[PDB]
């Protein structure tokens, strides 16, 4: 966990501070996996060119635009489709390199994630910085690893996994001990498959 | 993996199931940034159990071939052939998994995931394709180690793997060396929160 801290508090801070701006995308999914497992929602995710899994976003330069017009030009290039506003506006954290990272997030129409998807395979960035769009599965399988915690098992930019892991909270999306579970499965998970490779003694 | 030709697979005996599974790649002659050469791109799938694969599933020899099956649950919206056939190997409960291959240009890659995009599995079984990056950066783990840090299908990873040596994509050493340096990551990072 990062630690937090106020928009307005965030936007005074010296000139030794960057910024970046994210932005989860997701639509309620009513759905079921399986004819069994209800998916709950669908969340948006990204391959980056460095290998790990964030959201899209990026780097914002406070001086040149508004938080806002600054994610949107850099969603411009990855995903080419939408505009988000300040009443997306979610968070802002501080990251252990001074940058304090905002997350903004809005619920889409499931036909409004499927064309950002369809967008995202046609932008510019597609093929350099992003190499793919991802769906979180936030359901478990009856294994107790399948699903989401699997998925928590992949290898994140440290403060996207933090951001999803919080906004899936103060969104009501997951239950916050649903949460800990699964990635607490997550890192028994990660755990099982090193010591096939590199196990300790 | 215990590897066997395609001949030997068929005579595993009823008792053995298979699963065909695609490996689509392409020359890439991009630069990232312009300074480190991309080579080659290769397409995997986030699965519906959170993992990363490769397209394709299981395939009923009674009613398909192993050509014809494969087509039906590549799950992306081309057609391989018998000639795109790669290479066999055991699972570490009797699966046989048969991995095919084939070179596309870039833009047919694209056309893929275009199609892909669309396809009745796309937000089901299949929740999007990725590209791997085979490149290194300068820090040893930009690219490719990162990449191999992720969570695979353990038959999935061990076939990428297969496939980049001997396709020739790939030297041995600098698969060994992607490894080495994917695995110490996880291991860094697991110390962290199980030390």
């Known amino acids: 966990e990062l630690k937090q801290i106020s928009r307005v508090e965030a936007m005074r801070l010296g000139p030794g501070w960057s910024h970046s701006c994210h932005a989860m995308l997701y639509a309620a999914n009513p759905g079921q996996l399986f004819g069994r ?3 709950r929602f669908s969340v948006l995710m990204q391959m980056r060119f460095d290998g790990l899994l964030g959201f899209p976003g990026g780097f914002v330069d406070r001086r040149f635009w508004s938080l806002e017009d600054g994610l949107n030009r ?14 997306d506006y979610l968070s ?6 001074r940058v304090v990272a905002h997350l903004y997030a809005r ?10 998807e ?11 910085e992003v190499l793919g769009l991802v769906r979180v599965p936030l359901y478990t399988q009856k294994d107790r690893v399948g699903g989401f915690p699997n998925f928590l098992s992949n290898a994140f930019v440290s403060t996207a996994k933090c ?20 990635l607490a499965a ?15 003694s």
């Open 186 to 200: 997550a890192t028994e998970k990660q755990k099982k498959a090193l010591e096939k490779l590199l196990p300790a």
């Open 92 to 97: 802002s954290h501080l990251t252990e390199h």
């Open 163 to 182: 951001q999803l892991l919080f906004a899936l909270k103060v969104l009501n999306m997951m239950p916050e001990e649903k949460l800990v579970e699964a």
């Open 74 to 87: 850099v969603l411009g290039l990855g995903l080419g489709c939408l505009r988000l506003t300040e009443a």
């Open 107 to 116: 619920q889409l129409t499931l036909e409004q994630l499927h064309a950002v």
């Open 118 to 128: 369809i967008s995202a395979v046609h932008s510019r960035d597609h093929g350099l």
């Open 37 to 39: 497992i209800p998916m």
